[model samples]
Structure formats: structure tokens, C-alpha cells
Target: YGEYVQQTLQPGMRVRMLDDYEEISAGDEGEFRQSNNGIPPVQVFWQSTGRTYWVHWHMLEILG
Candidate 1:
């Protein structure tokens, strides 16, 4: 697993993870404000295991 990196996201846009993988990797964090356009789910890709997963943006709480 990897640490979550904060990233701002736009609604109706796809979360593209631009990284070449050879094994199990981590999902990077992408958050967006409330909008009429629903958020796009996360798509993961693993080259070694040939596995993938889809994750939706549900909720997030940011702390100062």
C-alpha cells in the first residue's frame, strides 16, 4: 500500500492513474466538491497479477 496523495477532482471527469505497474499497487486519493455531475469511480490496474478494481467516491473529511 502507498500513502494517499491529496488531489482535487472535477465532476464527470475520469480519475486517470498514470503509472506503469508490475504488481499490486495503491490507489491514490482524488476528492471533489459536491456537484450536479456525479463523480467518476476509480479504476485500478495491476500488470503483474492482471487484476483490476473499481472504486467510487463516497465521502471524505479533511482536517486542518
Candidate 2:
């Protein structure tokens, strides 16, 4: 479990999606969504197989 926190993805960076899809031919990208609400800051992504998928995020404070 300590290894999980070592991973993080930043914006403006591109990564290849492979071994997760069937129709995902080589050199195929940009099929992922740029944003969830069709705008910036609400970014979403699609699978390499042309299937839509999403991840969510939220904010919190330091005062517990």
C-alpha cells in the first residue's frame, strides 16, 4: 500500500493506453475526453477502446 501513494498523474502530459482494450490499435490516442462539462478544470478521459470512463476529485481543508 505504500506504493500506491507514490503514483500521480499531472495535466498536459500524455500516456499510452494499452492492454486494456480490444479495438485499441497502435498509435491511437486523443479519444479521451478533455473535460467532463465540455470545459476546462472538469477533465475526463476515455479508454483506448473508445469506451468512456471517468474519475472524480474533491477538495478539503487542513483543519481536522
Candidate 3:
């Protein structure tokens, strides 16, 4: 099985959405639950609206 580096991401880390590159989202602490079902879920937090969403690890990339 292939593992996503995003799964190794930590809370407060900066990341970008694979679909949308114009904006960036902060990693949420509540997310990053390891799932054996295949696709893993990660939480993204938007500062503007203070909203969060469950996203697949593949849909996100850690930003340096």
C-alpha cells in the first residue's frame, strides 16, 4: 500500500489543496486519523471563516 506524506503531517502545518492552489489551509489537530480502509482523512482549517473540512490525504500537500 502507498502511504501519503500528508498523513505524516502535523497540526498547524501549512498545506495546499490539490484542487485549489490559490488558497492555503492550516492542518487541524483533530484530523489525521489513520484509516486502514484505503483513503485517509485530514482536516483543513480556513482562517477566514474558521471552518474545517474532511479531506483525503491525497487531496492535500504539505507546504514548506
- TM-score leaderboard ranking: 3, 2, 1
lDDT of 1 by residue, 1-64 (tens): 1114125443333333334233433343222323323444344332345545443434221221
- Candidate 3 worst ten-residue window by lDDT: 27-36
Highest TM-score: give the candidate number: 3
- Candidate 3 lDDT at 43 equals 55
- Tens-digit lDDT string for candidate 3 (1-64): 1256544676566655555322443442223333335546555664544556666666666553
TM-score, structure 1 vs. true: 0.22
Query: Candidate 2, residues 1-64: lDDT per residue as tens digits?
Result: 2122113333433434332334444343432234334322223234355554332223100110
The models' CA-based lDDT, in order, is 0.34, 0.32, 0.50
How far residue 60's Cα lies from its native spot in candidate 3, in Å, is: 0.8
Question: Which pairs clash inside model 3?
Answer: none
- Name the runs in model 1 displaced over 4 angstroms: 1-37, 47-49, 57-64
Q: In candidate 2, which residue ranges exceed 4 Å CA deviation?
A: 1-6, 20-23, 30-64
Ranking by lDDT: 3, 1, 2
Stretches of candidate 3 off by over 4 Å are 20-39
